Amino acid sequence: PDVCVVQVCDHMQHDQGVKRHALTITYGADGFQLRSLIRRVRRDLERQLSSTYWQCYQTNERAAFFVTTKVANGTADLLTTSVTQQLVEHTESMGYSLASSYVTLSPDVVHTSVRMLIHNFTF
Amino acid sequence: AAFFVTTKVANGTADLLTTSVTQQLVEHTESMGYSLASSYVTLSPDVVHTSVRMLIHNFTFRRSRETIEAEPNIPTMHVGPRREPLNAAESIPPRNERAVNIWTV
Amino acid sequence: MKRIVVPHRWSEMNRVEHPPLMMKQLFQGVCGGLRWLETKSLAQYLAVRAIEEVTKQKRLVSYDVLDCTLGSGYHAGAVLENGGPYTRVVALDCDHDAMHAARDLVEEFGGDRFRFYCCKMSEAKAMFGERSFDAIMIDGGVSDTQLEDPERGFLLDDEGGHRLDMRFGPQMGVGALEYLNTVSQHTLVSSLLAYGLLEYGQAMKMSRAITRRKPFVDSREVLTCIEQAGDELPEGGWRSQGSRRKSPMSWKFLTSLRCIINNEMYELRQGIENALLMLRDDGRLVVFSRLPWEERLVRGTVDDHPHALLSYVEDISIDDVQIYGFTRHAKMWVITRAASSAYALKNTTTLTEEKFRESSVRWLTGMYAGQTHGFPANNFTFENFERKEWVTLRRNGKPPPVDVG
Amino acid sequence: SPRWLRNPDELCVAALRRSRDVNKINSYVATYKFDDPQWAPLLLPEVTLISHNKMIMLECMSRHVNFSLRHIVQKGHGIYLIYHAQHSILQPKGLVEQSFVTCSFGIRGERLRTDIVHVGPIDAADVMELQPSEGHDHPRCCFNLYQKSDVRRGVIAVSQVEGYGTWFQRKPMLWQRSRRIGALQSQLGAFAYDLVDPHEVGKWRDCEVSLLAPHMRFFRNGLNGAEAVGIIASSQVAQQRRLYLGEFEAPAITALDAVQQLAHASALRCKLVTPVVIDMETLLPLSWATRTPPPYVPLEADLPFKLQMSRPTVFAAYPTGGTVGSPFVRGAPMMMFEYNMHQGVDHYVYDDAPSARPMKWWSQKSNMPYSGYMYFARSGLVDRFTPSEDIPNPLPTKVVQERLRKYRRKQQEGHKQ
Amino acid sequence: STNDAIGYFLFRGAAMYAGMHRVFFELSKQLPHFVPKTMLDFGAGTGTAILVAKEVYDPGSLAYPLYRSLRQTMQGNDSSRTHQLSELRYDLKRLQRNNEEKKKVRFMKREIAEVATAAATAKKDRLVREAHARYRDVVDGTEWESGDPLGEVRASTEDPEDVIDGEQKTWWEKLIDVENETARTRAARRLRPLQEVTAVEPSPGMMEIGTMVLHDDVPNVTWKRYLLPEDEAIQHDLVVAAYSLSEIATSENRRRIVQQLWKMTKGVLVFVEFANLNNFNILMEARDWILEEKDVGLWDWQPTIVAPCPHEHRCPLRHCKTGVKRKRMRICSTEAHYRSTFVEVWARHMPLKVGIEPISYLI
Amino acid sequence: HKPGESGLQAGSSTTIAGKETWSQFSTKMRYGRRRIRVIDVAAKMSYEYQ
Amino acid sequence: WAAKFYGQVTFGPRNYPYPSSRWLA
Amino acid sequence: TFEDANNMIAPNAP
Numbered sequence A: 001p002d003v004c005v006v007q008v009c010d011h012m013q014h015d016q017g018v019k020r021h022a023l024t025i026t027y028g029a030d031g032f033q034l035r036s037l038i039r040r041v042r043r044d045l046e047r048q049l050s051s052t053y054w055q056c057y058q059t060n061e062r063a064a065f066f067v068t069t070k071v072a073n074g075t076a077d078l079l080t081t082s083v084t085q086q087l088v089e090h091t092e093s094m095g096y097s098l099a100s101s102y103v104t105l106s107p108d109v110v111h112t113s114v115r116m117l118i119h120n121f122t123f
Numbered sequence B: 001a002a003f004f005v006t007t008k009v010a011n012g013t014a015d016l017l018t019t020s021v022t023q024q025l026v027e028h029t030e031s032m033g034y035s036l037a038s039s040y041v042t043l044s045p046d047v048v049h050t051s052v053r054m055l056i057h058n059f060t061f062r063r064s065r066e067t068i069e070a071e072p073n074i075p076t077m078h079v080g081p082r083r084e085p086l087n088a089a090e091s092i093p094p095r096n097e098r099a100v101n102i103w104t105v
Numbered sequence C: 001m002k003r004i005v006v007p008h009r010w011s012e013m014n015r016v017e018h019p020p021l022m023m024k025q026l027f028q029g030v031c032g033g034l035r036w037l038e039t040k041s042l043a044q045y046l047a048v049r050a051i052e053e054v055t056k057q058k059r060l061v062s063y064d065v066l067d068c069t070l071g072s073g074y075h076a077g078a079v080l081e082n083g084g085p086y087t088r089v090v091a092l093d094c095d096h097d098a099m100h101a102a103r104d105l106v107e108e109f110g111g112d113r114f115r116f117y118c119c120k121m122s123e124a125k126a127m128f129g130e131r132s133f134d135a136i137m138i139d140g141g142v143s144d145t146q147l148e149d150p151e152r153g154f155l156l157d158d159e160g161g162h163r164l165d166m167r168f169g170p171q172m173g174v175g176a177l178e179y180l181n182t183v184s185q186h187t188l189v190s191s192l193l194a195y196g197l198l199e200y201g202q203a204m205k206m207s208r209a210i211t212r213r214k215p216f217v218d219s220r221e222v223l224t225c226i227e228q229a230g231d232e233l234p235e236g237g238w239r240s241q242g243s244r245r246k247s248p249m250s251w252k253f254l255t256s257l258r259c260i261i262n263n264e265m266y267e268l269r270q271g272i273e274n275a276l277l278m279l280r281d282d283g284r285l286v287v288f289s290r291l292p293w294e295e296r297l298v299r300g301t302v303d304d305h306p307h308a309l310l311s312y313v314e315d316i317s318i319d320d321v322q323i324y325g326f327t328r329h330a331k332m333w334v335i336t337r338a339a340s341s342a343y344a345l346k347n348t349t350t351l352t353e354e355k356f357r358e359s360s361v362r363w364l365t366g367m368y369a370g371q372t373h374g375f376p377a378n379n380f381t382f383e384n385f386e387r388k389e390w391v392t393l394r395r396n397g398k399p400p401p402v403d404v405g
Numbered sequence D: 001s002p003r004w005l006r007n008p009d010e011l012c013v014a015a016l017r018r019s020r021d022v023n024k025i026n027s028y029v030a031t032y033k034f035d036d037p038q039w040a041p042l043l044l045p046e047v048t049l050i051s052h053n054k055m056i057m058l059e060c061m062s063r064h065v066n067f068s069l070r071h072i073v074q075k076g077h078g079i080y081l082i083y084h085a086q087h088s089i090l091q092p093k094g095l096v097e098q099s100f101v102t103c104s105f106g107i108r109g110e111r112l113r114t115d116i117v118h119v120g121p122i123d124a125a126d127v128m129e130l131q132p133s134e135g136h137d138h139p140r141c142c143f144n145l146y147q148k149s150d151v152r153r154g155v156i157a158v159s160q161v162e163g164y165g166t167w168f169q170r171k172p173m174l175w176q177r178s179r180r181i182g183a184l185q186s187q188l189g190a191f192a193y194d195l196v197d198p199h200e201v202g203k204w205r206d207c208e209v210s211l212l213a214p215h216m217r218f219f220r221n222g223l224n225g226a227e228a229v230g231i232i233a234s235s236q237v238a239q240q241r242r243l244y245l246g247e248f249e250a251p252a253i254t255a256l257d258a259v260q261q262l263a264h265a266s267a268l269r270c271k272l273v274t275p276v277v278i279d280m281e282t283l284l285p286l287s288w289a290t291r292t293p294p295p296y297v298p299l300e301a302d303l304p305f306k307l308q309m310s311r312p313t314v315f316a317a318y319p320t321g322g323t324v325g326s327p328f329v330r331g332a333p334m335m336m337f338e339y340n341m342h343q344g345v346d347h348y349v350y351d352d353a354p355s356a357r358p359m360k361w362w363s364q365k366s367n368m369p370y371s372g373y374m375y376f377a378r379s380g381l382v383d384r385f386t387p388s389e390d391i392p393n394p395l396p397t398k399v400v401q402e403r404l405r406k407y408r409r410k411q412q413e414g415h416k417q
Numbered sequence E: 001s002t003n004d005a006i007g008y009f010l011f012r013g014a015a016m017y018a019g020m021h022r023v024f025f026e027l028s029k030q031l032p033h034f035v036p037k038t039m040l041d042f043g044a045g046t047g048t049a050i051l052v053a054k055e056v057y058d059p060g061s062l063a064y065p066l067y068r069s070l071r072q073t074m075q076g077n078d079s080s081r082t083h084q085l086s087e088l089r090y091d092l093k094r095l096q097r098n099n100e101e102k103k104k105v106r107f108m109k110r111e112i113a114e115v116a117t118a119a120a121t122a123k124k125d126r127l128v129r130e131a132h133a134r135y136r137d138v139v140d141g142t143e144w145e146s147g148d149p150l151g152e153v154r155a156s157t158e159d160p161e162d163v164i165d166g167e168q169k170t171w172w173e174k175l176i177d178v179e180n181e182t183a184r185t186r187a188a189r190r191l192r193p194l195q196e197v198t199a200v201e202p203s204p205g206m207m208e209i210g211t212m213v214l215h216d217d218v219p220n221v222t223w224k225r226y227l228l229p230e231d232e233a234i235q236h237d238l239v240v241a242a243y244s245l246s247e248i249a250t251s252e253n254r255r256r257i258v259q260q261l262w263k264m265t266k267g268v269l270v271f272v273e274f275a276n277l278n279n280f281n282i283l284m285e286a287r288d289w290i291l292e293e294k295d296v297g298l299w300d301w302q303p304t305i306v307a308p309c310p311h312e313h314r315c316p317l318r319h320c321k322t323g324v325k326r327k328r329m330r331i332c333s334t335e336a337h338y339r340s341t342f343v344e345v346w347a348r349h350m351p352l353k354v355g356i357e358p359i360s361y362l363i
Numbered sequence F: 001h002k003p004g005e006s007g008l009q010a011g012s013s014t015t016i017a018g019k020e021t022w023s024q025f026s027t028k029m030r031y032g033r034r035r036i037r038v039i040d041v042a043a044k045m046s047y048e049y050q
Numbered sequence G: 001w002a003a004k005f006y007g008q009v010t011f012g013p014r015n016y017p018y019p020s021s022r023w024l025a
Numbered sequence H: 001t002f003e004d005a006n007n008m009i010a011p012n013a014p
């Protein structure tokens, strides 16, 4: 497509004091090669962290999953930015260019079973 | 206005469904000669005693400038077994009443 | 010059067909017997005569088979393919979606060799008469085409949850989800005990869990409750190769419920009984059994019917179990309708001294009596027409005039 | 290229063929997968810049044949486990083409005894074709297996195994094993992991040696037996193309290789084979038996085990017997080794308090993965002896008429319609 | 259980059949033009209601013929009247002496061919009665046509006689109309009687017996195990609760069940019960509950009592003065007479050649 | 019960081989008496006709 | 003759004089 | 993954 939408939903949970979060990337269209993005993210994160603490694979066509179970604050901040950097760079390299990006979070001052960070890219 | 719903389904599946819906929305509105100028999203807290959340998502577009399928507006949900034969939909004229082709191909 | 096309659904696009099971064995058991040999000898006699050389036009030679359960046309197609020109099949699946397979069989073979009706097997005797088919084949249970379908509700692990309406054809009413939402604990326990798989204590536990955690929105919640009551469902989903007794209560409960909302016990019982009446003398009936209650019912019915005698039983080949993933317990029961009384042959092996003594006591006490004097009883007779009744048939063709009354 | 790990599900044998004779229903003919280069080194003799070794392939073939035949005794049982593998070679030289398998219930109605008779060339030199299209400095060799009349054949080996086909006992096989691997891992620090030079140990390369030199002890210079601590390292197995490994356990071949190896070392110490101080004289096994008593725990690979041997008795009435398991050859001297190996920590206890039962939970036992005996012959006297005894070599019209009659009827009737 | 259901059907089979006939007789006479295309049973233990409804609204679709000379066979329906006329023409042919000179021909004017086609169709409908099995034609050795092996085009073929309004007397003319049978057959085809019927029976044994009872005579009956509250969305032409309200459990809400039954009725809802004090109280409470619907909704849908009550006020027998002291003057029941079967004759020490079935009913 | 003889004509034969027990005879009679005598059509006239 | 319907009575109104079964004969 | 656990030691060719 001449315009593509990329949805990156980060679901944050925690039980018994161990906080985890799972990123889900989804593309609007099918023509994108997502095994390459998974490859690039693996290459760029094997250096930053051990695989015991994170895991990224392909759920199906044009959708990718990336969990992190036990990650410190600074390390989680590293992981998020690295994944976003690789996503944007891969999509732009495929022959696209980023037009707009915008995000939202659940305020939920009270305890909430899930927190959601919805990031939207337009290419 | 239009409507779309899903049932309790894995988070990745729900994300796929919504991403596809928005991708098709943008493609359809751009087919009319509109280029997506701006957009944004907002997620509200969950209701006090319930896990229901509300997500308000806005797009703004600026104006830039064969086989048909039968489909009822309101769909019919499909329980396991069919309640009518497979061919029940089709109506076919009497074989004697049928006539010869006027066109070709 | 536009074409009208109904959009395909995901189920229509991604449907898969049931694999063939015991092809050669079923063919040997169904196109085999006294009827088969006599048909072949009739073909010989006709070929010899052919070398020598408004009214209902009859077939010179044909072998009639009924398929009480045609899913994919693999079994109904084997009898027509490995058979010859002198073969005919009538299929009676209960699901309207089996016409998809029936259409392929009609396209491949003749329209004069195949017929299809959307009905349950128990009504075969109602839709036909006694002594109508040379062969009958029953393959109960569920077809693989229905397992994966998100709409049929047989699908397991189902990330998200569906409507658990796992029933065969529209001829049944409430599906499993609302059956579990409405049924009573005692009713569920009594219904489950009818199949033997689930012992009284286990049935009580499972029904207690269901009744306590109603109502159920969908399959994921139903399965959560079933998981809590009992062990995790085994790998391989519905088809588990483990032993019957050691299989988990969750799997046994799911199988029992799947049978309960399809009346499989009554359906199979009446299918076997009706087949033993609508089959021809020394005709052949084959029935597939995959559950202990099915095996028990087949054994008892054949041992008690005063015309049925079990020819033999064939298990499933491990090669087929490996390649197509069938349950290793699947066996084939070929039954034959003895022309005479089969008890003279069965007592050869089943007759005890206690049975002999109770038989003598029954004769002495006149327990073997029936009813012949009574309003409905006086109007009944054996199969052969009576002398007084041939007159009724000959007389209800033209009545006489009468002046008074 | 390597497959140093192999799941137990896969076997080295192709589909077996039951014999049609009414009295030979138990008889099957086995054809082994020579085509696969994976099993090619394991199912064909190794070539030295020949070794005559057979335990690398004889044991594998017998065990996998029994694994294939397990189904007729498994009865749907949870687990199937093989044991009591006896082998006796009638001719040390020559490779194998096929085998005949006769299966019975043995004694118990819960086990399955087998009898394997191997038939093939009794001389590998004739089939050898050296340096066929070497190309690179290292040529790739090939064997002509099925030959019309250029090869003389006969029985080469006779073996027998038996599988138990039983259930998974939770206690002896789940949470006692769970504790034993942990104890061995904790004990891992007690040993010194220094390998030994293979020249005095019988192997050619230092990559296929699993016998810790600092923990090899001999009594009266090995004249009364020997002990040795060894480790079947995944590192050693990976870059060694002969043997493979499981998910966690070590197969019987890679367990018996260490026995052969320590036997070679003890033979050097006892003056039974000529050392290197040139060509290497690796003693070869003629007949050997290996059993696993209950609980039939496998030999864990990544954790060390201590092997123990008896003094070599040199035979100029065998102590075992005349049946399968004892040598079926006579002539040059042989060397007998009784061996038992321990894999576990029997000396670790944790006595939290007398009131509880510390021994019923935290006690354990150094299991015996493989025990048995081996008969070896010096590599130089392979051709000195000949097989002693003699064993024989295991070497539609009416249906057509009926079918043609049927076709006659069908094609005749086709016209009338 | 199944044995209890067997005994219930044997002992109460004939009496319930008699009661259902006694009710459907009045229903057919009072609403002659009613024809239940679609039917529902609440608590169809043995399908006696289905059997009687089939017998009255479609006497020519049964496996066996009905007894012609019986007063029970003279119904006021339109379909029953069509079948009665068809059968009566036979007796008229009997009354007159005709030439009966058939014209048997062989292979060697077109009126002969068309009359032969009509006679072939008559034989086709004849064999269904004779063999007590539809589709009996195919099991013959006769060749099968290659036209409709699956019968898809027959079912999907548009009828050219059913047409919407826009899409396009004297005794002699009446006699000609009645003599012409093609119009009668077209009227029968226009009136599909009891084409789809659903029967509700939670009890597994009773459901098992009812399936067996009904399979031979009424084809394609949908058996539900339970009546869901969400099932109001579908209304049927006829809804019968025969001897069920009394056996509804006390834990369940009988008012809710009855309101659901009325709200899912596209027609002539029929309650039937045995004449008893408790059953009569139940039936009168139901009468009041449905009659509470008079002051709500479209007038063309509100309930009316077509029988037996001519008034829509309180029952004067339920509020009689004598009934307080006398238990006889409390039930506004009616009586059915039948030939008692040997099961009842054995269960009683009397011969009882004529058994009596008292019933209270409400249409 | 010998199959040849009737149910009330109790047989005098003492053999065992060609005999079926009386429970089996009862089951056979139940499975055999499953037909209706044909209903006279011309014998009795229609109620509407009368 | 009557107690054989005890296995048919539903669990609720099965032990009406005693709202429990553990302490039941 | 188990194969990912073995790949650190060495690769296998199935």
Ligand SMILES: C[S@+](CC[C@H](N)C(=O)[O-])C[C@H]1O[C@@H](n2cnc3c(N)ncnc32)[C@H](O)[C@@H]1O
Pocket: E016, E042, E043, E044, E045, E046, E047, E048, E049, E200, E201, E202, E203, E206, E226, E227, E242, E243, E244, E247, E248, E249, E252
């Ligand atoms: C005993 S009668 C059965 C025969 C039927 N009344 C007839 O005349 O043909 C009443 C039936 O109503 C059913 N029933 C009882 N309570 C019910 C309920 N709450 N909902 C639906 N059916 C019920 C029972 O299964 C019972 O078989």
Ligand SMILES: C[S@@+](CC[C@H](N)C(=O)[O-])C[C@H]1O[C@@H](n2cnc3c(N)ncnc32)[C@H](O)[C@@H]1O
Pocket: C018, C019, C020, C021, C068, C069, C070, C071, C072, C073, C074, C075, C076, C092, C093, C094, C095, C098, C119, C120, C121, C122, C139, C140, C141, C142, C143, C144, C168, C169, C267
């Ligand atoms: C196991 S599949 C048969 C597949 C195919 N005949 C074969 O063996 O390759 C059984 C089919 O019979 C149908 N069936 C189940 N119960 C039936 C019944 N009582 N009457 C008619 N069909 C039934 C199901 O819809 C299902 O598709």
Ligand code: SF4
Pocket: E308, E309, E310, E311, E313, E314, E315, E316, E317, E318, E332
């Ligand atoms: S039941 Fe009888 S008394 Fe009561 S309202 Fe009806 S007709 Fe009147």
